Structure formats: C-alpha cells, structure tokens
Amino acid sequence: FNILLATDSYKVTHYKQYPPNTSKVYSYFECREYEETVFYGLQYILNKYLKGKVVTKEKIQEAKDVYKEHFQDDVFNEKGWNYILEKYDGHLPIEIKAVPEGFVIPRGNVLFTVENTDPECYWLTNWIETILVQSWYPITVATNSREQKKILAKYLLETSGNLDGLEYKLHDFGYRGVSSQETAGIGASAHLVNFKGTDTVAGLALIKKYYGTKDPVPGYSVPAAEHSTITAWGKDHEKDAFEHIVTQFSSVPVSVVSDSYDIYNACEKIWGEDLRHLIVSRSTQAPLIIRPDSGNPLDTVLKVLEILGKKFPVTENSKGYKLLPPYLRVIQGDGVDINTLQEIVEGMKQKMWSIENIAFGSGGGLLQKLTRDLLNCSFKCSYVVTNGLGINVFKDPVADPNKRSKKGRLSLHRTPAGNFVTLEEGKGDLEEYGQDLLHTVFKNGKVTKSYSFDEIRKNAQLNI
Amino acid sequence: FNILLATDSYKVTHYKQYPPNTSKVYSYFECREYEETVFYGLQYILNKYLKGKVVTKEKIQEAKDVYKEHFQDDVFNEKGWNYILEKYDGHLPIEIKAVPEGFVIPRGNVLFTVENTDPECYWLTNWIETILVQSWYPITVATNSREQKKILAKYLLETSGNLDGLEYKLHDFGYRGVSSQETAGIGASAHLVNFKGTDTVAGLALIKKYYGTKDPVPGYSVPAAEHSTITAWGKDHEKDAFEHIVTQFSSVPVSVVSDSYDIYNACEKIWGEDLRHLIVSRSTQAPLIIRPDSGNPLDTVLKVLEILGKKFPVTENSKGYKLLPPYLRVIQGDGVDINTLQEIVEGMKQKMWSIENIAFGSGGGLLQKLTRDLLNCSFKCSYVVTNGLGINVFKDPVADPNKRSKKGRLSLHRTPAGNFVTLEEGKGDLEEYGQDLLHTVFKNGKVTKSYSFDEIRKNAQLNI
Ligand SMILES: Nc1ncnc2c1ncn2[C@@H]1O[C@H](COP(=O)(O)CP(=O)(O)O)[C@@H](O)[C@H]1O
Ligand SMILES: Nc1ncnc2c1ncn2[C@@H]1O[C@H](COP(=O)(O)CP(=O)(O)O)[C@@H](O)[C@H]1O
C-alpha cells in the first residue's frame, strides 16, 4: 500500500490550484441533513493506512512513474512529498479531531476535522479526503444495522414484554454479497457494533486487530444447511438429508434450509410428521431452526408459522401472542433489508405471532445495498489561512440548499437540553456552550486517542 | 490472508452434512434469468487468493483456534485440511472451467464450474463458493458500465454520425464512494473493460499485476478543480479562482466545478463575459470543461447549454444538432447512474444538442449502487458422485421458478444461429453442438489459462 497512490487522480494537481501563500486548509466530515448516525470506522483507517512512516523514497518514485503515464505529463508534487519524508521521517503532518467512535449523533453535525500542522503541507488535508471519506461505509452499515435493531426491539417488546435474544435477531450473511474481502471485514465489524451474529469471519479479526474486546470473539454462529447439502441427497431423499443433519447436530442449535422443493410440504409432512419425533425431543438450548428462502417473505413466514402451529404445541405468552415450543424456531434469510424486516414483524404482530418465534439473516441488504447518498456523507473545506489571514470558506449551490456547507473552524457541543450543536466560525472559542466534544485522534503520524470495541458498543446502545 | 478463514462460517460444518460416500461435488455459477453479462474478474481471485500453497500448518492451527471460539464447539475439519497440506503441499485439489474473460453471455448460462479433483476433497468445492461468488461484483460493474456505453453509443451516433470519444464519455470518479480500498481497485478495473477514464489509480495497478496490457497504463485523467480549490479563494473571488486555474492548465483540458455559489451566473457572467477571452483562445486539444454539480441533472445540463450557446459561437453539425466550439465542453458528474445518464442524453437530443457536447462522471452510481440481485449471480451444486454413482442435483422452490437451478454436468455452446446454449445432464458429451466454450483456468493450485486485459477489452466490444 502506497498512500501517494490512494487519492483521486485530479487531487494530484490541486496543490497548484489553491490561492498563493496558503498555510492552512482545514476540512470537516458530516452526514448532511435516518436522523442520527453511529460514528464508527475511522480508527481502522488511521491505523491501517495513515499512521507511521507512510512515505518512503521508493513510494515517491513509484508514484512519480505512475502519474507520468496516467496524466502523460509531470504534474506530480514530488517536492512536497520529499519534504514530508525528510522533515518528518515520512510521518504525515496532519491533525484529525473526531467524536468518540460509537457515538450516536444527529445529522448535520461535524463528526471529524482534518488540518495540516505544517504550512508547507497545506495541500495534504485534501489529498487524504478520498481515503478518509471511505468511513461513510462503516458509518452507514452501523447506522442501518442500528435502525434495524430499533425496529426489532419495538416489536419484540410489544409482543413478548422484553428484549431477550435481541442481539442475535439479525445475523450477517453478507460475505459473498459484498464487493470484496476487505469490504466483508469492515462491514461485518460495523454490524457487530449492534449485534452479536456474523458468518463473516474477517469481521472478528478486524475488531481484534484495530479495536479490541474483552471476549475471545465479538461474533457468533451455529451449524446450518445450505441448498447443496440438502439437494446432494437427491430429490426423493430430502427427508434423509433432514434426518442426517439434525442427528449430526442434536445437541446444538441447527438451521435447516427447507424450501429446496416445497417448503410447505417440508414443514407439514417432513418436519411435522415423519421427523416430528426428532424435533420434540430437542433441548431449549438446541432448537431446530426452520429456514424458508423463497416466495413472498411475509406470506411465506405466515404460512410456515400456521403450518407449524397446527403440527406442534403452541402456547400463548403473557402478552397474548402465539409462541412455538422452545425446540422450534424460524429464520428468514431471503430478501431481508430494513424495509422488508419492518413488514415481516408488523405482519407477524397483526396475526398474533410473537417476534420470539423468528430471527433474520441478511446479506446484500445489510452490507452492500448502501451508498454514500443514504446519509449524505460529505467532506468539505470550511477554513483556510492565506497570507496569514484566516477566512471562512463554504459552498452554497443556488439550486440545492441541502448541499450548503459549514463555515470556519468547527466544534461540537452539548446544548443546555443535552442535545448536540455544531458551532461555526470559531464560535466555540467563546465558551458559551462548554467544551468541544471532538478529541484529537491523530497527529503528526501518531494515533493519539483510541477506543476498544466494548466502549464503541456501549456508546451505540439503544435508549432501551 | 488465510483461505481457511475466508468462507461463510456455516460452511465449516458442511463436510458432516453431505451424503456419506460422496466423492465429487460439482457446482456452477450463473447470472440467473440486463440481458447479457460481461464475464470479468475471476482471474484476479484465482491469483490473489486461490493459487499456490494456500494451506500451511500455521494456517490450520489459526483456523482451529478461531473456530473453537466462534462456534463454542469443535466442528472445524482439521483432518481434511491436513490432507491437502500433506498430499498436495498445500495446493487446492480443485478444477475450475470458465468462459473466457470479457465474453458477453446471455442470462441463465453457465459461466464457470467448480469440482474437486480428489475424492477426499468433496467438501472443498463449496468451501470456496463464498470467495468465488464475489466475482458477482466485477461481473456486474463491467456489465452495467457496458450497458451505459450502449446508451452513449446510440445517442452519439444518432446526434453526431460517429463514435469518436465514446471511450472517454463515462469517467470513474467512484474512489471515495466505494466501501473499501480493495473494492476501489476491483471496480475501477471492471469499468476499464469498457472505457479508458478513471481517477482511481488502484484499478491500473490491479490490471498490470493480474491481467497486463501493451499500454503503459489502461486509464487516464485530466486536471480538475474541486469545491475546496475554488471556495478557498473566498466567495467574492470565484473569478480569480477560475482565472488562476485555466491559466495554470492553459495547454491541457481542464475541468472546473462551476456551481459553488450560482452555476448559472458562473456560466453566463464569469465564463460568458469576464473570462471569455481566456476560453476562446484555447486549443481544441485543451478545452475548458465546465462542471455543474447540483440541481436536477437534466434541467441543469440543459440550462447550462442554453446559457453557453448564447455566449459562445454554436455551430450545427451534419445531423442538425447543436455543437459548442471545440474549446468548450460540459461534464455532468452529479447524480449519474444508468437511469439518469439515459434521461440526460434523451433530454439533450430532444432539445437538439449533440452528445458530443457532454461527458459524464459517475461515482456511487458506477461502483457502489449495485448488488448480487441485479443479475441474480448464483453458485449452486448440479452434480454429485455418491457410492460411485453420478446423480443430477438441483433446487426447484415451489413458490419461485426463477430460482430453479440447472441439473447435472454442464457445458456452454454456440448454437447453429450463433447464440449460446448451456447443455445439462452431461449432454455436451454427445457432441451435437461443437466445442465446450468453458476452459480449464485452474487445476490443483495452478492457474492454467490466462487472458491479458487487451483480449478482455476486445471480447467485451459493442456490436456496432
Ligand atoms: N444459513 C443461513 N441462514 C440464514 N440465511 C442464510 C443462510 N445462508 C444463506 N442465507 C441467506 O441467503 C444469502 C446467500 O444467498 P444464496 O447464495 O444461499 C441463495 P441465491 O442468492 O443463490 O438465490 C445470504 O446473504 C442470506 O441472506
Ligand atoms: N472532477 C470531477 N469530474 C466529474 N465528476 C466529479 C469530479 N469530482 C467529483 N465528481 C463527482 O462527485 C463525486 C464525489 O462527490 P463529492 O464529495 O465531490 C460532492 P458530495 O458528495 O460531498 O455532495 C464523484 O464520485 C463524481 O461523481
């Protein structure tokens, strides 16, 4: 990895575009006015890409050669990078201040600020915009995950009277459905800010390396069939496949994909009749989890539940909602995103089914179907010093007031009612609103302030 | 990077789930029935992740320990993995056959197949599903980028009578808008199958390392302002910003974001009067490229063109469409995806503006707003050998015929009319349909057939 090659091409020329005698460029990240965002993921970037000796004589030469061909010209700022190498032993002269990770913050508030700490390196702040802006992704995954947890909590409370099991109710199965290995680890770690369940091993390793937890792992999984392990038995042997699998995993929970040929038949005749004896013997600590995986997600779930309700001993919990026996559960892993999750739980509640009966798996919906537009993640310059004079800078496009950016030096504060406000134009120096909530997390090549994953989870909790 | 840790967790238990006495699991990848897809990206994954000695004792222990905590149980198949270490010096006993990269293939056809080459390794075919299915992403980016190129081609032809500059009409600005560094490089390279322009330099490194071109670089870029380099001058000095930049880059094309404050004023009064003299003197090889970046994408483009056509000498081309002077162009980079690109060119044609006038930048729309669902990318088992008998396996969910998978051993053929057919149930052996288009690309830890990026581009060409 070469930081000199991890920027948008066109930023290679920007050092020639600033007003002459600019000694300072100060920029900020916000999610422009999903009402509140979880701040997560910056520390990963600081550690993996930004900290330490990131410039070498070989990296300079590599970038020189690449840009010569990419531009067919010599725009590359070889001198500026040589300066950083010689003066700072390749350590970036940059200060980054940030809200603590895990913090839940309303939209349109400053989340982090970047500035150069050497006047020669005015051009550096925005060189690193590209890399730092990728934090949109773990912010957005964490926020969307947390929004889903809010929905799950509402209906579990309504239908059961408590939140037992909540943190296992939405499980990450997005490994194959993301755009890369590196994305898999980052997104899975972001989901684990809110939940405990992941099939994406790389998330755990990222957390261990970049954040740290008290546990050996933050993420968990249970044995489960896939279509290949059922259909390999042949069409006429779906029952033999079912019986082999539940018997192989008779004392731990086991998920079994049941829609290979006919989901309604598998539930009513195979699970509900031929193999019933192997289900009702099972422990509360080791349920069979029936997995539909096709058809209309709500309609399938309701019909699966009605079928099981006629074949197995259903009870009524203290809220008046129907509850399967504890050795039997359902998981819906097909077509799950925030919208369909809401429809499924509302539709279950309407038909008097406890949210205790169900859990969810999500892949693309959880980790891939998300863009920087969802939270309007944006990084803009708000303050420059030119000729020793500091000036408040901003954009304000005529045709879109939503893209208006903030002015001057920024700080984040608690209001007297305990909400958040971002003060502009250096006004946080007036001290009418207490101390700035941003901390310096990076300075001159060093990470200066850090958070364990446990602090992060704590910060990201629902009100409850 | 540990391949034993690069699967969905639940797959760890699948060696216990297949029928006893199974010696072969054969699986295939298709984009289930955007009617034709560009097959691109597998060769990256083969080289980075799959080839050579991928198993070591250290990797085995690491996996063993992680899995003990994740599952809170001993389910990891140490014996299977140790067998591969000792018998094959850690090389994967797997054969993969694939259609050549760059091939454009209709929906619902086999694109690659995977099988174990040693009966002891039956479980390995689907171990590596997760990592292989990640090919959905470069497949999908290349396909969606080619589809935008068809739209571009159509309207450029209709409005100008040729395709000059087509390969430069859609520029990749998606670096900051993707989910990670790795995605950035994979996505940029997939876009370069169809176009020449990227600001994501990692795409170029990937292509050189994994595919190779006779070109010194496969992608190119031009000097461009951002809001920071314009707004830094202060609100009253937009004109000085503009002036400084076009003078810095007088002899090459230069793109200037013009909507910081009021794009309509910038075009009419700043470019159109104040700085008109610095524009009209410019070379055809070095235009000013005006960049709007807000408002309704179509409306803003049209109004920008209306303003400019009143301040600058418009001609009418041989097809009757209006054309700005060669020193003056426009680039829309805001809000651009396949849908809006189509609306803009059609809006332009309706108002009698040539598509020669415009180029497009796309970020999230190009590299991030895509999922596995768009082309229904799917990997499924179609054939097993159990007790020395081959059986044809498939799924066929009652409620969703779109999810029916293919049966038996598969091959891809040219039809007599020159289309594609996938033969099922090993019927390709009857040899009624000429050569199987799938070629072995991986066998037993070695990459066996490679494509340069040059063949890939040639294979992915438009009809025209
Ligand atoms: N064991 C499991 N439990 C719950 N959901 C699962 C699951 N295995 C797979 N899924 C669901 O199915 C997705 C993976 O898609 P598949 O490759 O199994 C089916 P298809 O996309 O080929 O039609 C996951 O992202 C998840 O939503
Ligand atoms: N030089 C340029 N030419 C064309 N489009 C550009 C561009 N620079 C940025 N863009 C467009 O804007 C996207 C980057 O978003 P920005 O951070 O510049 C504005 P915002 O996202 O904060 O509202 C790029 O992916 C691209 O579509």
DSSP of B41-80: -HHHHIIIIISS----HHHHHHHHHHHHHHHTS----HHH
Read off the DSSP letter of residue A192: T
In angstroms, the first-to-last Cα distance of chain B is 43
Question: A463: which residues sit within 8 A by CB, 6+ positions away?
Answer: none
Question: B432: which residues sit within 8 A by CB, 6+ positions away?
Answer: none
Neighbours of A415 (CB within 10 A): 10
A174 interaction partners in chain B (CB closer than 8 Å)? none
Backbone angles phi, psi at B9, to 5 degrees: -45, -40
For residue B16, how far is its CA from the centre of ligand 1 (angstroms)? 19
User: A224: Cβ below 6 Å to ligand 1?
Assistant: yes
As to burial, measured by CB atoms within 10 angstroms (0-12 exposed, 13-18 middle, 19+ buried), residue A63 is: buried
For residue B399, how far is its CA from the centre of ligand 1 (angstroms)? 17
- Residue B383 belongs to domain spanning: 1-133+372-450
Atom of ligand 1 nearest to the CA of B380: 22
A461 and A380: one domain? Answer: no
Read off the DSSP letter of residue B4: G
CA distance A141 to A375: 11
CB contact under 8 A, B227 and A22: no
Q: Residue A366 is encoded by which pair of tokens?
A: 């959880």
Pairing of strands A288-291, A254-257: parallel
A51 and A192: one domain? Answer: no
Q: Residue A187 is encoded by which pair of tokens?
A: 């997104």
Residue B215 carries which side chain, given as an amino acid letter?
A: D
In order, the DSSP letters of B305-338 are: HHHHHHHS--EE-TTS-EE--TTEEEEE-SS-SH
Question: A431: which residues sit within 8 A by CB, 6+ positions away?
Answer: none
For residue B227, how far is its CA from the centre of ligand 2 (angstroms)? 9
Contact A188, A197 (CB under 8 A): no
| Closest-CA residue of chain A to B187 | A179
CA distance A254 to B16: 13
CB contact under 8 A, B200 and A244: no
CA distance A431 to A411: 11
B220 and B108: one domain? Answer: no
Length, in residues, of chain B: 464
What is the distance in angstroms between the Cα of A159 and the nearest Cα belonging to chain B? 29
As to burial, measured by CB atoms within 10 angstroms (0-12 exposed, 13-18 middle, 19+ buried), residue B282 is: buried
Long-range contacts of B234-240 (CB under 8 A, 24+ apart): B234/A391, B234/A393, B235/A393, B235/A394, B235/B261, B237/A19, B238/B266, B238/B270, B239/B270, B239/B274, B239/B275, B240/A19
**How many angstroms from the chain centroid is the CA of residue B442?**
22
Contact B224, B290 (CB under 8 A): no
For residue B143, give the nearest of B38, B35, B39 by alpha carbon: B38
Name residue B386's beta-bridge partners.
B22, B389
Neighbours of B316 (CB within 10 A): 11
Which of B73, B216, B399 faces A300 most closely, judged by CB atoms?
A: B399
B269 and B361: one domain? Answer: yes
Residue B366 carries which side chain, given as an amino acid letter?
A: L
CA distance B349 to B158: 9
Phi-psi map region of B171: left, alpha, beta (phi>0 left; psi -120 to 50 alpha): beta
**How many angstroms from the chain centroid is the CA of residue A19?**
38
Question: Edge-to-edge strands of the sheet including B94-98?
Answer: B389-392, B377-386, B22-31, B110-116, B94-98, B439-443, B446-447
A155 and A260: one domain? Answer: yes
Method: X-ray
A75 interaction partners in chain B (CB closer than 8 Å)? 223
CA distance B383 to B399: 23
Q: Residue A334 is encoded by which pair of tokens?
A: 């097909």
Tell me: is residue A326 an annotated ligand-binding position: no
A45 and A158: one domain? Answer: no
Cα-based distances in Å from B155 to A65, A405, B30, B193, B357:
37, 36, 31, 21, 12
Read off the DSSP letter of residue B285: T
Cα-based distances in Å from B299 to A324, B160, B355:
56, 22, 15
As to burial, measured by CB atoms within 10 angstroms (0-12 exposed, 13-18 middle, 19+ buried), residue A316 is: exposed
Name residue A390's beta-bridge partners.
A385
Contact A8, B199 (CB under 8 A): yes
- The helix-helix angle for A338-350 and A297-311 (nearest 10°) equals 40
Binding pocket residue ranges, ligand 2, CB within 6 Å: A 10, 378, 403; B 173-174, 176-177, 224, 226, 255, 291, 331, 333, 361-363
Contact A379, A132 (CB under 8 A): yes
In order, the DSSP letters of A12-77 are: GGGGGTSPTTEEEEEEEEEE----EEE--SHHHHIIIIISS----HHHHHHHHHHHHHHHTS----
In angstroms, the first-to-last Cα distance of chain A is 43
Q: Residue B175 is encoded by which pair of tokens?
A: 């670096």
Contact B87, B118 (CB under 8 A): yes
| Closest-CA residue of chain A to B179 | A137
Q: Give the DSSP H/E element, type plus range, for residue A97.
A: strand A94-98
What CATH number corresponds to the domain at position A218?
3.20.20.70
Neighbours of A100 (CB within 10 A): 16
Question: B219: which residues sit within 8 A by CB, 6+ positions away?
Answer: A70, B172, B188, B192, B196, B197, B198, B203, B204
What's the maximum distance between 2 C-alpha atoms anywhere in chain B? 84
Name residue A380's beta-bridge partners.
A28
The residue written with tokens 């302030």 in the block is: A449
Residue B343 carries which side chain, given as an amino acid letter?
A: E
Contact B372, B136 (CB under 8 A): yes
What is the experimental resolution, given in Å to one decimal place? Answer: 2.1
Contact A295, B399 (CB under 8 A): yes
CA distance A274 to A457: 44
Question: B335: which residues sit within 8 A by CB, 6+ positions away?
Answer: B297, B365
CA distance A300 to A312: 18
CB contact under 8 A, A368 and B372: yes
Residue B12 carries which side chain, given as an amino acid letter?
A: V
Length, in residues, of chain A: 464
A122 and A170: one domain? Answer: no
Pairing of strands B254-257, B94-98: unpaired
A225 and A345: one domain? Answer: yes
CA distance B120 to B28: 20
SS3 of A142, please? helix
What is the distance in angstroms between the Cα of A412 and the nearest Cα belonging to chain B? 22
Q: For B404, how many CA atoms within 13 A lie in the half-sphere containing its CB?
A: 10
For residue A334, how far is its CA from the centre of ligand 1 (angstroms)? 7
CA distance B415 to B438: 15
Contact B263, A398 (CB under 8 A): yes
Contact A434, A413 (CB under 8 A): yes
B180 and B310: one domain? Answer: yes
A6 and A96: one domain? Answer: yes
SS3 of A123, please? coil
Question: B410: which residues sit within 8 A by CB, 6+ positions away?
Answer: B28, B110, B113, B382, B422, B423, B424, B428
What's the maximum distance between 2 C-alpha atoms anywhere in chain A? 84
Contact A1, A125 (CB under 8 A): no
Q: Domains in chain B: how many in total?
A: 2
A106 and A163: one domain? Answer: no
SS3 of A335, please? coil
CA distance A387 to A389: 5
CA distance A297 to B283: 60
Question: Edge-to-edge strands of the sheet including A254-257?
Answer: A170-172, A358-362, A328-332, A288-291, A254-257
For residue A168, give the nearest of A158, A153, A186, A183 by alpha carbon: A153
B360 and B216: one domain? Answer: yes
Tell me: is residue A364 an annotated ligand-binding position: yes
